[PDB]
Amino acid sequence: SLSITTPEEMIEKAKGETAYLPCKFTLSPEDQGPLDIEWLISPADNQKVDQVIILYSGDKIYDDYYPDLKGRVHFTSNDLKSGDASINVTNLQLSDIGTYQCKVKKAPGVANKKIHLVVL
Amino acid sequence: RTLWTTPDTSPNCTIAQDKDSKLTLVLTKCGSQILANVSLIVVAGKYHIINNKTNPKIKSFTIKLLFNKNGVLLDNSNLGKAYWNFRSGNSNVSTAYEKAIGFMPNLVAYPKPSNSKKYARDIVYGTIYLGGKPDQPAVIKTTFNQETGCEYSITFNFSWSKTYENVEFETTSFTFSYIAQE
Ligand SMILES: CC(=O)N[C@H]1[C@H]([C@H](O)[C@H](O)CO)O[C@@](O)(C(=O)O)C[C@@H]1O
Ligand SMILES: [Ca+2]
């Protein structure tokens, strides 16, 4: 079935640097639907629901979401549809620490990955 | 000379959580080729016990070794620095090395990603066996100089196709070589 490499991952990077958050996926032959990528963050406030970061949908990028990351998050691949939904986060702050989720869908295929990001 | 993790490392690798694995890696310099020997024991966390009946989508994970211009291992590598060093007996020399460019994967042989796709020759594939059982293959895919945020890199990807049920992820050993930077 549809799967993502290293579906739970811990990443550490230093303050001011750029984090590379990998989301490399493998499709199955049955996955003939439209490709849909969603990244989310779990806020440090545990009483707040997850927030959308960035989307790839209908071959377009939508990034007008989580304000703390606005302008700092981008898809890294020049060919995302070939299996690379990775993003980077520029100028890391200590407040960027948290759990990030990549959701890859191509109906009926679905997979998700969680990254625990630590900033030192 | 030999640059290594030692042959019986304490947990030295962080994949899903801190110190969840033991990567054994021995690099021995034979002039312009490095002779390499590798294995993995996962000791805790997501990848420790594989159960694809309960977790059908856990099929692949990656360990990255990132090096600076001096061949020094970077902090954000999955492999930890403390016991990655030149050998002394069955352990390491006491002081951290400052230079190991002669052990780095050659950048002309294996260039970083660019407008050019990396050729397949920048990869070596091997099959290892979980728990030493012949019916429990997994693939180790090793790529040279794939990664960003470093001068050099060695990436180890571990993957499998079979539906493993309660199989501990600890592998047989695999030997390969690569072209040295100098
Ligand atoms: C060491 C080795 O070569 N193992 C191979 C085995 C053995 O030949 C048989 O299990 C023994 O009967 O066969 C496979 O098809 C398997 O079981 O997945 C492929 C695997 O690579
Ligand atoms: Ca939470």
Author numbering:
A (entry chain B): 19 to 138
B (entry chain A): 184 to 365
Please give sentences taken from the publication describing this entry:
We show by structural analysis that the CAV-2 fiber head also contains a sialic acid binding site, but in contrast to HAd37 this site is modestly involved in hemagglutination.
Among the HAds, serotype 37 is unusual: its fiber head can bind CAR, CD46 and sialic acid, but the virus appears to use only the latter two as functional receptors. Burmeister et al. found that the sialic acid moiety bound to a basic patch close to the center of the trimeric fiber heads of HAd37 and HAd19p. Our results demonstrate that HAd37 interaction with human erythrocytes is primarily due to sialic acid binding via a conserved sialic acid binding site on this subgroup D HAd fiber head.
